[PDB]
Design a protein around this motif. Structure first.
Motif, PDB file in Angstrom:
ATOM      1  N   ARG A 274       0.807  -1.220   0.000  1.00  0.00           N
ATOM      2  CA  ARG A 274       0.000   0.000   0.000  1.00  0.00           C
ATOM      3  C   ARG A 274       0.843   1.276   0.000  1.00  0.00           C
ATOM      4  NH1 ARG A 274      -0.210   4.471   3.443  1.00  0.00           N
ATOM      5  NH2 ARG A 274      -0.923   5.825   1.733  1.00  0.00           N
ATOM      6  N   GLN A 275       2.067   1.210   0.523  1.00  0.00           N
ATOM      7  CA  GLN A 275       2.877   2.407   0.691  1.00  0.00           C
ATOM      8  C   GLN A 275       3.235   3.019  -0.665  1.00  0.00           C
ATOM      9  OE1 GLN A 275       3.611   3.785   3.748  1.00  0.00           O
ATOM     10  NE2 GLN A 275       2.250   2.190   4.551  1.00  0.00           N
ATOM     11  N   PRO A 276       3.492   4.330  -0.710  1.00  0.00           N
ATOM     12  CA  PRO A 276       3.827   4.977  -1.986  1.00  0.00           C
ATOM     13  C   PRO A 276       5.134   4.459  -2.570  1.00  0.00           C
ATOM     14  CG  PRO A 276       3.117   6.599  -0.377  1.00  0.00           C
ATOM     15  CD  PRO A 276       3.298   5.310   0.371  1.00  0.00           C
ATOM     16  N   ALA A 277       5.319   4.731  -3.865  1.00  0.00           N
ATOM     17  CA  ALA A 277       6.432   4.141  -4.604  1.00  0.00           C
ATOM     18  C   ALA A 277       7.780   4.630  -4.083  1.00  0.00           C
ATOM     19  CB  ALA A 277       6.287   4.442  -6.095  1.00  0.00           C
ATOM     20  N   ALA A 278       7.877   5.916  -3.731  1.00  0.00           N
ATOM     21  CA  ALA A 278       9.134   6.441  -3.204  1.00  0.00           C
ATOM     22  C   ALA A 278       9.474   5.812  -1.858  1.00  0.00           C
ATOM     23  CB  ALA A 278       9.064   7.963  -3.082  1.00  0.00           C
ATOM     24  N   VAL A 279       8.460   5.584  -1.019  1.00  0.00           N
ATOM     25  CA  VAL A 279       8.687   4.912   0.256  1.00  0.00           C
ATOM     26  C   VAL A 279       9.139   3.478   0.026  1.00  0.00           C
ATOM     27  CG1 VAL A 279       7.560   4.068   2.346  1.00  0.00           C
ATOM     28  CG2 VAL A 279       7.113   6.394   1.547  1.00  0.00           C
ATOM     29  N   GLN A 280       8.513   2.790  -0.934  1.00  0.00           N
ATOM     30  CA  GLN A 280       8.782   1.369  -1.137  1.00  0.00           C
ATOM     31  C   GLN A 280      10.217   1.124  -1.588  1.00  0.00           C
ATOM     32  OE1 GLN A 280       5.761  -0.168  -3.779  1.00  0.00           O
ATOM     33  NE2 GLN A 280       4.281  -0.426  -2.110  1.00  0.00           N
ATOM     34  N   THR A 281      10.762   2.009  -2.428  1.00  0.00           N
ATOM     35  CA  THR A 281      12.143   1.845  -2.875  1.00  0.00           C
ATOM     36  C   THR A 281      13.122   2.009  -1.717  1.00  0.00           C
ATOM     37  OG1 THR A 281      11.648   2.563  -5.134  1.00  0.00           O
ATOM     38  CG2 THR A 281      13.931   2.763  -4.383  1.00  0.00           C
ATOM     39  N   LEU A 282      12.884   2.990  -0.845  1.00  0.00           N
ATOM     40  CA  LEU A 282      13.779   3.201   0.289  1.00  0.00           C
ATOM     41  C   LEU A 282      13.731   2.028   1.261  1.00  0.00           C
ATOM     42  CD1 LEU A 282      13.227   7.004   0.952  1.00  0.00           C
ATOM     43  CD2 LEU A 282      15.387   5.904   0.368  1.00  0.00           C
ATOM     44  N   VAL A 283      12.535   1.493   1.517  1.00  0.00           N
ATOM     45  CA  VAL A 283      12.405   0.375   2.447  1.00  0.00           C
ATOM     46  C   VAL A 283      13.071  -0.873   1.880  1.00  0.00           C
ATOM     47  CG1 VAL A 283      10.770  -1.128   3.635  1.00  0.00           C
ATOM     48  CG2 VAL A 283      10.331   1.328   3.505  1.00  0.00           C
ATOM     49  N   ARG A 284      12.962  -1.083   0.564  1.00  0.00           N
ATOM     50  CA  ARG A 284      13.653  -2.209  -0.057  1.00  0.00           C
ATOM     51  C   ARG A 284      15.165  -2.063   0.064  1.00  0.00           C
ATOM     52  NH1 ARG A 284       9.403  -1.785  -4.098  1.00  0.00           N
ATOM     53  NH2 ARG A 284       8.108  -3.679  -4.092  1.00  0.00           N
ATOM     54  N   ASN A 285      15.680  -0.840  -0.084  1.00  0.00           N
ATOM     55  CA  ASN A 285      17.119  -0.637   0.040  1.00  0.00           C
ATOM     56  C   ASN A 285      17.581  -0.708   1.491  1.00  0.00           C
ATOM     57  OD1 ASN A 285      16.897   1.434  -2.772  1.00  0.00           O
ATOM     58  ND2 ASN A 285      18.295  -0.317  -2.630  1.00  0.00           N
ATOM     59  N   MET A 286      16.719  -0.334   2.443  1.00  0.00           N
ATOM     60  CA  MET A 286      17.052  -0.522   3.853  1.00  0.00           C
ATOM     61  C   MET A 286      17.185  -2.001   4.184  1.00  0.00           C
ATOM     62  SD  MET A 286      14.824   0.644   7.181  1.00  0.00           S
ATOM     63  CE  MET A 286      13.297   0.243   6.334  1.00  0.00           C
ATOM     64  N   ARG A 287      16.335  -2.826   3.576  1.00  0.00           N
ATOM     65  CA  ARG A 287      16.422  -4.271   3.733  1.00  0.00           C
ATOM     66  C   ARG A 287      17.815  -4.776   3.377  1.00  0.00           C
ATOM     67  NH1 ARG A 287      11.825  -7.135   0.339  1.00  0.00           N
ATOM     68  NH2 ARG A 287      13.303  -6.187  -1.138  1.00  0.00           N
ATOM     69  N   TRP A 288      18.365  -4.296   2.260  1.00  0.00           N
ATOM     70  CA  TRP A 288      19.652  -4.796   1.792  1.00  0.00           C
ATOM     71  C   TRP A 288      20.808  -4.246   2.619  1.00  0.00           C
ATOM     72  CZ3 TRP A 288      20.496  -8.854  -1.062  1.00  0.00           C
ATOM     73  CH2 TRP A 288      19.506  -9.300  -1.946  1.00  0.00           C
ATOM     74  N   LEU A 289      20.765  -2.956   2.963  1.00  0.00           N
ATOM     75  CA  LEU A 289      21.827  -2.379   3.780  1.00  0.00           C
ATOM     76  C   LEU A 289      21.918  -3.075   5.131  1.00  0.00           C
ATOM     77  CD1 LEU A 289      23.996  -0.369   4.499  1.00  0.00           C
ATOM     78  CD2 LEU A 289      22.218   1.322   5.003  1.00  0.00           C
ATOM     79  N   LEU A 290      20.770  -3.416   5.719  1.00  0.00           N
ATOM     80  CA  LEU A 290      20.767  -4.161   6.973  1.00  0.00           C
ATOM     81  C   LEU A 290      21.457  -5.509   6.810  1.00  0.00           C
ATOM     82  CD1 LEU A 290      19.481  -4.295   9.955  1.00  0.00           C
ATOM     83  CD2 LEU A 290      17.702  -5.649   8.830  1.00  0.00           C
TER      84      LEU A 290
END
Ligand SMILES: CCCCCCCCCCCCCC(=O)OC[C@H](COP(=O)(O)OCC[N+](C)(C)C)OC(=O)CCCCCCCCCCCCC
Ligand SMILES: CCCCCCCCCCCCCC(=O)OC[C@H](COP(=O)(O)OCC[N+](C)(C)C)OC(=O)CCCCCCCCCCCCC
Ligand SMILES: CCCCCCCCCCCCCC(=O)OC[C@H](COP(=O)(O)OCC[N+](C)(C)C)OC(=O)CCCCCCCCCCCCC
Ligand SMILES: CCCCCCCCCCCCCC(=O)OC[C@H](COP(=O)(O)OCC[N+](C)(C)C)OC(=O)CCCCCCCCCCCCC
Ligand SMILES: CCCCCCCCCCCCCC(=O)OC[C@H](COP(=O)(O)OCC[N+](C)(C)C)OC(=O)CCCCCCCCCCCCC
Ligand SMILES: CCCCCCCCCCCCCC(=O)OC[C@H](COP(=O)(O)OCC[N+](C)(C)C)OC(=O)CCCCCCCCCCCCC
Ligand SMILES: *C/C=C(C)/C=C/C=C(C)/C=C/C1=C(C)CCCC1(C)C
Ligand SMILES: *C/C=C(C)/C=C/C=C(C)/C=C/C1=C(C)CCCC1(C)C
Ligand SMILES: CCCCCCCCCCCC
Ligand SMILES: CCCCCCCCCCCC
Ligand SMILES: CCCCCCCCCC
Ligand SMILES: CCCCCCCCCC
Lengths: 246, 246
Positions: free
Chosen positions: A172-188
């Motif tokens: 449901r989250q907006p597209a700009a939010v979704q890209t950042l959260v996906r990249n936070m997943r990888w950095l973690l």
């Protein structure tokens, strides 16, 4: 044993760089509260607290390293005061649960779900750090492998749980939010993966002094990636979420 | 003359720290374009270009320092390759005008005013840097004072003009914008003031090698304050201005 010029400096420089990165980021994260909406300021404040604590311990770690060796005969000989390996693990025990708070806080989960998620992850992180310490300080390779393998179990649990929860928050989250959260997943995943790899160095043969230098440098770069760098991604998520709330 | 262990490392560490700060900030500023409105993205891009250029030169400066001394007999003796003092001044000639662009760009002035303001400031910065170089490389104290005093004239012109223009831009702007612009005024004054103070060290008595170490370290910390740290303030102004435009 004794350390060469270049070996003592590499660690000396690594600890100095960490002090600067933690304290400078602490000032940034504290002030950046004013750039995000009220609902996301707690994540910024916790991030500032994380790097302030880590900065304090790296100041103590820097002094312990400085006091452990002495320059004589063109080399650095070991002094009487032994290096304090416990500063880092005590730091991890306090900041890793806070990093978990920061992660859950910027996702804005309901309390009925956020609270048991945090307890299970915090308990796992304590088990991970506590089981790693006896293997870290051992002079015996078999002991280092056994405790480190046990420590990998809660380590894998934390990363799996965080990957799933971050993936489930995407919807449901907006597209700009979704890209950042996906990249936070990888950095973690990548930043936390540096720790067990660095822990493995003393067993890949190599000189013991070269291995010990590599472990200290590896943990320090990992701390920089997992706390202030990770915190910048959290800050960006808070900025975009603030805008989506208009 | 020869340099002690601690003196060579202090400069060695200072250049290493600068490379990391410039390149890490370059990645941040480039990506941060996506967090601000279209009207302010040019200031973020120029900031990324500034620190990328400075990062390149500090990489070359780091190698010139590394190749100028050699570890022998427990000390660092001067080699045949002399340190290249020109890398820094060539870097300043390119990045200082770009810093002036970044400053004018985030204030969103009309072109009829922004263009002659930029030309006068750019011409002054070239005069400032060009007159400073012969005094920087002299082995004679009287020569260092004369060229450095001449260089202070366009230096004072730039800081006065920027203070007035930043103060005049304050009017009508929202309160959050006004506080950031006032603090940018001070960071500009204080960070740029480090350069002539560092230039003064070889004349305050003290050992010549201690003075030369202090000059190199002072310029490097000043570059970090005046480019990436200054760029973070520009980024915050762009964030608040983006919001005021709703
Ligand atoms: C640039 C920031 C420099 C930080 C201060 C430099 C440390 C230093 O020069 O050593 C000071 C004394 C011994 O120095 P000295 O006797 O001059 O040799 O020994 C000490 O270290 C005394 C400790 C003073 C407090 C140092 C706090 C460091 C804050 C760093 C924050 C970095 C933000 C970017
Ligand atoms: C919270 C309660 C923490 C109790 C232990 C922390 C106190 C401490 O500083 O321990 C340091 C020692 C090393 O001592 P030393 O080598 O003298 O430094 O040992 C260590 O370096 C600590 C490394 C982890 C061992 C203790 C882990 C279990 C305590 C966590 C309990 C959390 C309860 C919620
Ligand atoms: C390298 C490890 C960090 C990876 C950073 C991932 C950047 C990212 O999430 O995508 C950029 C988007 C741009 O939004 P969009 O408008 O979709 O283009 O998200 C943004 O809005 C940009 C936000 C930039 C925050 C991340 C910048 C941190 C880089 C730190 C440099 C590390 C040096 C070792
Ligand atoms: C952490 C980042 C480390 C950067 C690379 C480390 C430099 C290094 O280890 O020296 C590599 C070789 C000689 O090394 P070695 O032969 O292993 O002694 O000599 C060189 O320096 C080769 C140059 C390779 C490119 C280095 C580019 C540095 C990028 C730094 C960006 C920092 C972002 C935070
Ligand atoms: C733009 C035209 C720039 C012409 C000079 C820049 C080329 C250059 O690399 O000069 C380096 C020499 C030092 O040579 P070296 O010691 O061999 O390194 O001298 C320097 O280190 C440069 C320091 C400033 C001296 C030249 C300043 C006047 C040229 C600026 C003209 C701008 C016109 C808009
Ligand atoms: C130290 C030299 C930089 C001084 C930073 C000035 C911070 C500032 O302008 O005031 C904070 C306001 C908060 O807004 P407000 O909502 O009015 O409270 O503006 C903001 O919205 C916060 C924006 C933070 C950007 C400045 C943070 C840079 C600190 C870098 C740390 C330097 C380490 C040596
Ligand atoms: C800010 C400090 C952080 C995020 C600490 C992270 C520490 C780990 C991810 C622990 C890694 C370990 C194993 C999984 C292998 C055995 C030894 C450990 C404790 C280093
Ligand atoms: C990013 C690099 C920057 C902003 C360079 C700034 C350089 C100055 C403000 C120059 C200072 C000088 C005088 C005013 C005194 C004489 C010598 C100089 C060139 C260092
Ligand atoms: C941002 C606040 C961090 C302050 C760090 C102080 C560290 C003091 C160390 C004292 C050791 C005796
Ligand atoms: C962000 C782009 C900066 C790239 C810097 C490259 C530096 C290369 C130096 C080569 C010297 C021979
Ligand atoms: C030990 C590494 C654990 C990796 C967890 C990633 C889980 C992704 C599955 C979707
Ligand atoms: C050489 C220092 C120049 C300082 C310029 C500040 C001008 C402020 C006057 C309002």
């Amino acid at each position: 044993d004794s350390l060469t010029y270049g070996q003592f400096n590499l660690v000396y420089n690594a600890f100095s760089f960490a002090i600067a990165a933690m304290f400078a980021s602490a000032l940034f994260f504290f002030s950046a509260q004013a750039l995000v909406g009220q609902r996301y300021r707690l994540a910024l404040l916790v991030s500032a607290i994380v790097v302030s604590i880590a900065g304090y311990h790296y100041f103590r770690i820097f002094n312990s390293w400085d006091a452990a060796y002495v320059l004589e005969n063109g080399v650095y000989s070991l002094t009487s005061e032994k290096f304090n390996d416990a500063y880092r693990y005590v730091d991890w025990l306090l900041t890793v649960p806070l990093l978990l708070v920061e992660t859950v806080a910027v996702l804005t989960l309901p309390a009925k779900e956020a609270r048991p998620l945090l307890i299970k992850l915090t308990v796992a992180s304590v088990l991970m750090i506590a089981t790693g310490y006896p293997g870290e300080i051992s002079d015996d390779i078999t002991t280092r492998i056994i405790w480190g393998t046990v420590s990998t179990i809660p380590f894998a649990y934390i990363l799996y749980v965080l990957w799933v929860e971050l993936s489930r928050s995407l919807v449901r989250q907006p597209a700009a939010v979704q890209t950042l959260v996906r990249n936070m997943r990888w950095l973690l995943l990548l930043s936390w993966g540096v720790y067990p790899i660095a822990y493995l160095l003393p067993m890949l043969g190599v000189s013991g002094t070269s291995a010990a230098v590599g472990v200290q440098v590896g943990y320090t770069i990992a701390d920089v990636l997992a706390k202030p760098v990770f915190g910048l991604l959290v800050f960006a998520i808070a900025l975009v979420k603030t805008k989506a709330d208009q």
